[PDB]
Amino acid sequence: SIWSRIVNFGSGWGFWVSPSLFITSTHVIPQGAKEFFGVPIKQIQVHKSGEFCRLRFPKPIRTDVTGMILEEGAPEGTVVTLLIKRSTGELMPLAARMGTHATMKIQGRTVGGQMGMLLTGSNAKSMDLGTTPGDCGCPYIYKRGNDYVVIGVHTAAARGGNTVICATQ
């Protein structure tokens, strides 16, 4: 169910927070885009905050989804779930402990957001089930009491597979 909310978007992924609210990364959205989900961009409310992108639609497309809470990051030390999909069919829940806010440069590209450490990053990578460049846009979600909270979207991972950056807003 939650997995049906994470969909291909551009060169990566995005996530439906509510029937009219979709979050992704600007790194994913192709250059020169004109329409999203059949809706002209001029009709879509667009908020970009660094690598974080928030789209709100005039009409409730995806009427099946239950709206979730969108927050800016998580308290330091909070364990969250990183829900990554691959184009090949794998659905992978990785555990992530969130740290402080940071800026990171890997390959000339600079990203910013909340830093996190994957608890099994090295383990998943050793079996070729770790983070890859195509995982950009996948959500960081945790359950707070009876709330389901989305704290941001994936934008980068270190080559070792353990250090990640979550874009927020």
Place this chain on the structure above:
Amino acid sequence: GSAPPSIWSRIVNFGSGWGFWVSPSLFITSTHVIPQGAKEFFGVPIKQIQVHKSGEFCRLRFPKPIRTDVTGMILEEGAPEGTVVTLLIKRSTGELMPLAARMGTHATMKIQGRTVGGQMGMLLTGSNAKSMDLGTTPGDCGCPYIYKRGNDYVVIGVHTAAARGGNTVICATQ
């Protein structure tokens, strides 16, 4: 030549659940899901299959190298306590989901009127496995627990049962 097959292609429906090809002629599953009706498994008659059982663990060795595409893999009884392993869950829905688990000590529990046993593990999914649409189901019985040591893959057993909370699972071994 051709690409080696995906490790996921080695997980096949068997009876009511799944089993896993460890070698071209070595298939492991859970006894809970065995059809126990017909006299043929794959293309061999039961009488020609060498069978070894231990509790909920079932080991079938075939006289012929069937699944010729499969690279042989190490089969061991459990893993050292503390090892993080991957539970490769395949569902008939087409969903492929690897879950991390940290393995504990040998354990026993009761489920659905029967006693099961093997090595326990706790799922490492961040939030609780059943909080979100994660965690295992009875239909996942027989899926393998695998980890990598050095450059080799090691299989430690198959899925048998899970706690009512969904966060503790047990791995049948032998």
